[PDB]
């Protein structure tokens, strides 16, 4: 009656049956579209304009009020309207092919209203509005187009079966979770931020004048979701002042207000009240002693009105009357102070209570009673997914659209023109803004590009199925990528189960870019009202009636960072809340953290909290199953039975949700993990349980197995248990076999290199015209596989091959991380691949005249024709599929008319009227035209895409890698006869050097080879899942059972001499990957060619025939060598040699005519004394740039002593 690992994997299988790997993106977007858009519309629902009566002296002057109310929003399915005006439903593949944004139009119900003031003599603002005119029904008005995330509930592919996906040219394996903007796929990278409504106390480092700072980043639940931030700074002890003063930094205040003054502005004038707010214990004298100096500092202000005046004088406005200053101070104190607590009248008591709480926390850290906060604790951070981000963007864009509508109202009213609702809205605002933000990633308005966030949207990575899965689950921390702050980059303890420990890029973004674990769930947010209602009805004492003195031992209750009140029995409250969540009466995303030392009960329901699921251990006092998992074997058998059953209703099967709603699985975030005790496996629970039942928990232990620490006797109750430790890994770390037998940076290196492995990325790559694609001819699934691969679908779309690898020193061509590849194996298709590239062109147009034509250009009329071949183009200016092209051969023929007024030296004969703008093939590439797609673009102009294919056979210089960070290039290829063989005639496909193994300590590579050999011999698949009881001893026994040396060695013979090698070789199958780094993609040589126009130096880039940079370090190396002429050649004769004539009198470049051999300096009237200077063109450019700043850099060739 103990849970097994097979049962754990059945539970995980159910999880992934009901959960997609793109679930976070999809659910966030669904939340944004279904709910957040309506809330954003409502928050700015009404627009009102009051036309007062100007005193023009004409009888008939009456004030008017015009009102526009924005109603419900309607989102249709994505559609396209053509040039001819026909409107059709649009499908993702057509959008990808024709470069169309896959967006759905949005309509909003607007209603208009006009009212007349009852009397015009009333003071402004007191006019009574009588209903004059009103729209009987609303007008459904198109306001914009929202890009639709693929596979979301509003996509055309939602609820669509596999067969219909094929009919649409869609891969059933594709998970969606992205957008199509102008044909390109864009994924929104989750953005990490610090949580709002949390008080964080930070110790400022010396010699900063501030000792400690308590900061809260207050955000309204839905009212723009984050505006105000406050600080409470304690100032450092000074030799002049015997005490430290507490000053509150508030929005829109130029100075730090002493805390007592802001308390008085809140009505807590008496000192006793203030120190009861701050120091809840009268008997504690250190707190009051530290508060005394600020009371001393703030005695000059003893009343609320004087405190408000003090605040107002320090507002951003100077030279204002006292009444306005007091009004402004009260307005700031009400609205811009702690808006998450409240923003409405009569709530100064709660804000004062929370301010006292913040001061108490900061002084607890200043007394060194509690440690400061950890800025990097994962439970204090939130992930903004597509939902929240698109919500902020749409709020901004809808505000801009409403401003436009209001300006339209004002302009129409001024001119007495009739107001039309349809003409009022500039629908281009929302459409263009969303399109621009999703396309460029620059997050915000086009006009605030520098201040906007960047890189929020990235082109989806279609190199391998696993790389795409990884890209859909990527988080970015917007820390400075140049500043060297190792702490944010480090792997925190709280990352356990939330972020992948291994998968993180190497380089500047190491540790900042993170990847969600397999079972990590990111909350989308839920209402806090039901939870507050349950708290109120269960005995929550409101904060208005709370008196700390009466109940100092009672526990503060927070919800979303709002101190709602105080409870007297927080244990029972917490058990009741947890029970409710365990029935889903409360949302499963709700964090219920009881902090016993701090006497707090924090509830969280907001979005962005990363959670992970865990088993629940039965802890009920009267239960007969103390210390045993709630989930029985019966529940597992139910999962197996309902997995296959399809006759059952799809929504009424027993699966993952049935476990959560039944109280057998619980989602915990990092905040709640701090209050739980988690067993690492059911066997650990059991061992602890016998240890606690008096049994010795002792037995004969397989010496080959991992050694675990003995069960801790100090642990008597476990609250949870992990479903499987292997779930702490990401997409790519879950493809590594035996990752727990490797040195961790090798796991990171494999996680990075698995993205670049060649395979089949989508099944529909044939019908997709991608810019770049690399496809493996004969992909094979690994012989050694992890159980997590079933959910990553690596067996379905693998990205490598099982090569027979021998670890041997054979001819010395595999040294320094090179490999030797069998040439016969290459000839038979090993690691062969296809490279597809796509060239896009289209017809342009300006005004009413088309200035481009897809045609076969003719030498006799087209000016400036390229040097490539125009003979492979067909009559329609294009190139047919199946033809062979190379280098600069033209694949698309396009011409542009020239203005009739242009006269280019007569080179443009009377026949020459056009100019060639054709598209040549890349100079460094050649192949066969695979495909030529022809269509029309959004503007009804012709639009062509030419896909070329080119087979790449492995050769010397091509990167290959194992799944263990073992990367190399091919150094040499030997044929079948020349390679070492076994007594069966097995010849390895690859030979790798032994020296790669010891230093790197990639023992997982050797264990993989042995296990793959066993599985190839026996046919059973090899389980390489981490943290299993699969030992090398068991694999050795299995291998010996097949008549092989147990450790994987084989007697091999020399191919050259047939002699039996003195050493026995480690030979067996290992999964290798062809990497996107091919030598021919990189080989580059330049003799001469293009130069930059400005500097006249070799251009940059292999693709554009550019030179290589001779940098500062190379110059230093040649200096230390002493090779003066080498430097002169590299930096002058080979880059930008140039000649000028300087005047020997003034030292400035002269006017030189070499044709006439006449030189002149008008300034000096010099025509005889000149010098010839050889210098870099960049030097002459620098000198001219200086002369443009009135600096005269003068070159004198003779010592002017």
């Amino acid at each position: 009656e103990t849970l097994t690992q097979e049962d754990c994997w059945t539970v995980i299988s159910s999880f992934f049956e009901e959960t997609s790997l793109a679930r976070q993106q999809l659910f966030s977007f669904d939340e944004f579209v279904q709910n957040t858009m309506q809330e954003i519309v409502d928050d700015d629902s009404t627009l009102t304009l009051d036309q007062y009566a100007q005193h023009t002296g004409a009888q008939g002057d009456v004030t008017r009020r015009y009102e526009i109310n924005f109603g419900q929003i309607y989102l249709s399915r994505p559609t396209m309207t053509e040039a001819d005006g026909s409107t059709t439903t649009m499908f993702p593949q057509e959008a990808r092919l024709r470069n169309l944004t896959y967006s759905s139009p949005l309509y909003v119900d607007m209603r208009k209203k006009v009212m007349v003031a009852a009397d015009s003599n009333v003071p402004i603002g007191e006019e009574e509005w009588l209903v004059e005119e009103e729209d009987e029904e609303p007008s459904k008005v198109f306001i914009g187009k929202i890009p639709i995330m693929l596979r979301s509930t509003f996509c055309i592919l939602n609820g669509v079966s596999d067969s219909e996906l094929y009919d649409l040219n869609e891969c059933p394996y594709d998970q969606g979770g992205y957008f199509i903007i102008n044909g390109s796929e864009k994924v929104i990278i989750a953005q990490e931020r610090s949580a709002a409504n949390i008080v964080q106390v930070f110790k400022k480092a010396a010699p900063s004048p501030i000792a400690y700072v308590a900061e809260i980043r207050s955000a309204l639940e839905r009212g723009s979701r984050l505006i105000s931030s406050m600080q409470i700074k304690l100032m450092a002890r000074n030799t002049e002042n015997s005490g430290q003063t507490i000053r509150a930094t508030l929005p829109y205040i130029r100075s730090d207000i002493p805390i007592v003054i802001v308390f008085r502005a809140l009505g807590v004038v008496p000192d006793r009240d203030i120190l009861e707010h701050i120091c809840y214990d009268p008997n504690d004298f250190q707190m009051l002693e530290m508060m005394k100096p600020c009371i001393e500092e703030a005695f000059v202000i003893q009343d609320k009105d004087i405190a408000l005046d003090y605040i107002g004088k320090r507002g951003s406005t100077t030279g204002v009357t006292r009444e306005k200053r007091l009004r402004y101070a009260h307005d700031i104190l009400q609205k811009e102070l702690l808006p998450h607590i409240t923003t409405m009248e009569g709530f100064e008591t709660r804000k004062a209570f929370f301010l006292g709480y913040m001061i108490h926390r900061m002084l607890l850290c200043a007394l060194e009673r509690r440690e400061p906060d950890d800025r990097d604790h994962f439970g204090k951070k939130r992930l903004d997914l597509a939902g929240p981000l698109l919500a902020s963007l749409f709020r901004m864009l809808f505000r801009k659209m409403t401003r436009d509508v209001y300006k339209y109202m004002q302009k129409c009213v001024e001119t007495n023109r009739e107001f039309n609702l349809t003409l009022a809205v500039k629908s281009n605002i929302i459409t263009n803004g969303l399109r621009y933000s999703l396309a460029t990633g620059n997050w915000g308005d086009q006009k605030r590009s520098m201040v906007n966030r960047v890189g929020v949207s990235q082109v989806l990575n279609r190199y391998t199925f696993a790389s795409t899965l990884s890209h859909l689950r990527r988080t970015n921390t917007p820390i400075g990528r140049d500043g060297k702050l190792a702490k944010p980059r480090q792997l925190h303890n709280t990352h356990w189960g939330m972020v992948c420990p291994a998968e993180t890029p190497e380089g500047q973004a190491c540790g900042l870019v993170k990847n969600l674990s397999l079972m990590s769930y990111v909350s989308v947010g839920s209402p806090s009202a039901p939870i507050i209602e349950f708290l109120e009805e269960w005995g929550l004492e409101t904060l208005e009636d709370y008196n700390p003195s009466a109940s100092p031992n009672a526990t503060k209750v927070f919800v979303n960072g709002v101190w709602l009140g105080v409870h007297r029995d927080p244990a029972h409250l917490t058990e009741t809340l947890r029970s409710l969540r365990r029935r889903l009466d409360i949302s499963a995303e709700v964090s219920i953290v009881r902090d016993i030392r701090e006497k707090e009960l924090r509830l969280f329901t907001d979005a962005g909290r990363i959670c992970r699921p865990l088993f629940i251990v039965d802890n009920n006092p009267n239960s007969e199953r103390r210390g045993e998992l709630c989930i029985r074997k019966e529940h597992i058998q139910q999962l197996i039975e309902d997995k296959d059953r399809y006759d059952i209703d799809p929504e009424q099967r027993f699966g993952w949700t049935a476990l959560v709603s039944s109280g057998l699985i619980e989602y915990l975030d990092a905040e709640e993990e701090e209050t739980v005790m988690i067993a690492m496996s059911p066997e650990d629970l059991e061992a602890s349980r016998q240890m606690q039942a008096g049994y010795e928990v002792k037995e004969e232990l397989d010496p080959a197995q991992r050694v675990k620490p003995a069960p801790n006797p100090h642990v008597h109750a476990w609250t949870h248990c992990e479903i499987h430790p292997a779930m702490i890994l990401g997409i790519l770390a879950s493809i590594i076999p035996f990752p727990d037998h490797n040195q961790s940076p090798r796991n990171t290196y494999q996680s990075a290199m698995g993205k670049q492995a060649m395979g089949v990325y989508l099944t529909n790559y044939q019908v997709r015209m991608d810019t770049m694609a690399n496809i493996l001819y004969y992909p094979q699934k690994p012989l050694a596989t992890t159980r997590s691969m079933e959910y990553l679908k690596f067996r379905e779309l693998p990205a490598g091959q099982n090569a027979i690898v021998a670890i041997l020193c054979y001819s010395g061509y595999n040294q320094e991380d090179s490999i030797i590849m069998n040439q016969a194996s290459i000839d038979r298709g090993l690691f062969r691949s296809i490279f597809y590239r796509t060239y896009t062109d289209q017809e342009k147009k300006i005004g009413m005249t088309v200035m481009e034509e897809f045609e076969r250009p003719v030498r006799s009329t087209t000016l400036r024709m390229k040097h490539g071949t125009y003979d492979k183009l067909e009559d329609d200016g294009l190139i047919a599929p199946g033809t062979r092209v190379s280098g600069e051969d033209i694949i698309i023929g396009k011409t542009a008319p020239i203005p009739l007024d242009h006269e280019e030296l007569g080179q443009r004969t009377q026949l020459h009227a056009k100019r060639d703008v054709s598209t040549p093939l890349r100079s460094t590439e050649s192949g066969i035209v695979d495909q030529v797609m022809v269509t029309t673009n959004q503007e009804g102009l012709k639009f062509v895409k030419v896909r070329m294919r080119s087979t790449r056979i492995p050769q010397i210089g091509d990167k290959f890698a194992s799944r263990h960070g073992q990367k190399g290039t091919i150094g040499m290829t030997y044929r079948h006869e020349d390679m070492p063989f076994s007594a069966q005639g097995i010849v390895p496909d690859i030979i790798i050097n032994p020296h790669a193994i010891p230093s790197r300590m990639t023992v997982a590579h050797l264990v993989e080879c042995q296990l793959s050999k066993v599985s190839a011999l026996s046919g059973f698949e090899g389980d390489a899942t981490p943290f299993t009881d699969v030992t090398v001893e068991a694999v050795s026994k299995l291998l010996r059972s097949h008549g092989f040396q147990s450790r994987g060695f084989e007697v091999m013979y020399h191919g050259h001499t047939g002699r039996k090698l003195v050493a026995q070789v480690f030979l067996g199958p290992t999964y290798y990957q062809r990497l996107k780094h091919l030598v021919d993609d990189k080989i580059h040589a330049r003799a001469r060619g293009p130069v930059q126009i400005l500097t006249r130096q070799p251009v940059e880039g292999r693709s554009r025939d550019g030179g290589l940079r001779f940098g500062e370090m190379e110059r230093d190396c040649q200096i230390s060598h002493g090779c003066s002429s080498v430097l002169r050649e590299r930096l002058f004769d080979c880059s930008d040699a140039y000649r000028v004539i300087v005047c020997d009198i003034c030292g400035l470049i002269a006017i030189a005519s070499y044709k006439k051999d006449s030189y002149e300096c008008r300034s000096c009237q010099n025509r005889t004394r000149f010098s010839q200077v050889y210098l870099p063109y960049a030097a002459k450019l620098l000198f001219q740039e200086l002369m443009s700043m009135n600096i005269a850099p003068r070159l004198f060739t003779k010592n002017h002593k």
Binding site: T88, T89, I156, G159, V160, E164, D167
Partner: peptide, 16 residues
């Protein structure tokens, strides 16, 4: 929604 999506996909020729 699934049925509507199926209807829209299958008749894309007729609805065009």
């Amino acid at each position: 929604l699934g049925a509507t999506n199926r209807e829209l996909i299958n008749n894309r020729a007729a609805n065009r």
